[PDB]
């Protein structure tokens, strides 16, 4: 399938080897500062450890305008925060980040501050200027379906046209085909059924002919369908990244890194991948 | 896609609402006699509560004689551990039973005593005369793909090859076609290699228009690929589960029953199934 590996300045991601696992970084602030304080800096630099340790090739940074129950936050507030944890994680762990923003502002400093991969939520959507940002520093971007509305015509069709807009916003930036990485965004504007209704369809995708990252870890489209909470989701989750893989993904996004690890190279060694 | 339910006497199956996980009874005999004292009955009956609960829809019981690491035994042994088994189990656990048996004798005496459905490793092969006592009692009969060498000119057109000798068998006895359930056999006469050359093509196992179930929990397969003990190979299992699911069968025949459970209910959802 891919005739080029995924360059990440000092590391280098190879596509056809293996399903690629990116970690999610765990981020609990500390209600005393604004960033960059040891207790958070440190719990921050010891997950990624675990991770990298469990089988982890990316680990995935974020700061609190994306990440779930917070409030919208700054720019200059969301770079304090993310850019301590981006240095210490990235001298301390020895494998590429993903910085998780759709503000062209933070992707920046991200990147400047160690970050090799951009996580965009909004397809460069939100911030035309991030796609910028990723042609300057020609470091890879991940751009997501999302929408402001769950009007579909024809959900799949929709997703793809939109997943367009987004790759064209990108590519007349300058970036380069091979710096481009689409997600579905399952549990954006998407109903429970609309989610499992793009898990039935992912395959389609691929025609577009750039890699897949899937992020279905925990979503409560899998506590609806098992009536599960949270933390009750490891096997619901295990059964997307599955379905996903088998579907044509190249990532996948996951809380539960040694377990979706495991998951991921047993369904590697069936499909024939590497 | 079915047009009728599997009938287990007391209790039907239904296979288009979803797939069914089949629980392996774990037998513990006790040292000190040949079959039905109370702490080996006690424990199986616990057990099948437990899997039961958990969210089994058939219970798996089997004899010395073809459970891993035992010598062959004698017909008359191996009903004397077997049936007591059944006769607790069965009027304890409301749910179909099958009896884990290549030996006619032992499967009549197990249906007698209470099993539902009959599971035979040699798919009528080892004693024909098993096809007849499926006909009599007019229950349902896995027959699973079996062979005395692994000499394959092609792995899967030889295995759909010898299923349909085992359907001849079957057929021959008066079996009727909805009494036919068949296994690709994981694990019996393959290389590590070509288990995992039917995982990846089990979808063609469906020409042959019966409902199929899958058996891969914790085989070595999974600890070849992985790298792992017996007690370590959940995450293993649960992608064969899924992509057992996705390629079209109807069971599943775990040890794990909570977590498969899980999976399948998952998938199920994904794939469209109910
Ligand atoms: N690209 C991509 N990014 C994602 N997330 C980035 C935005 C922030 O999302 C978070 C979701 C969960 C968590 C957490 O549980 O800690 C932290 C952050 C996706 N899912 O949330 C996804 O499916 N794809
Ligand atoms: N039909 C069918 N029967 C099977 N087994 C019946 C024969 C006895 O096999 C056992 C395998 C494992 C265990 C156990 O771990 O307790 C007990 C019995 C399959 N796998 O072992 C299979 O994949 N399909």
New binding site residues.
Partial sequence: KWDYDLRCGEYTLNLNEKTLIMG?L??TPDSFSDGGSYNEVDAAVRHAKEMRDEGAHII?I?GES???GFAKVSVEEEIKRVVPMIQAVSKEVKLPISI?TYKAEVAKQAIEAGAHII?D?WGAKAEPKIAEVAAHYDVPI?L?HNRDNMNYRNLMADMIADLYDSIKIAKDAGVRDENIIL?P???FAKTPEQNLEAMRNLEQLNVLGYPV?L??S?KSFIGHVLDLPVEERLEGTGATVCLGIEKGCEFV?V?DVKEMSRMAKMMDAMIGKG
Same sequence: chains 1, 2.
């Fill in positions: 999610i765990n981020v995935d974020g994306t990440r779930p998780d996580n939520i991940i997501m997600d965004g399952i549990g990252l992020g279905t925990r996004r809380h």
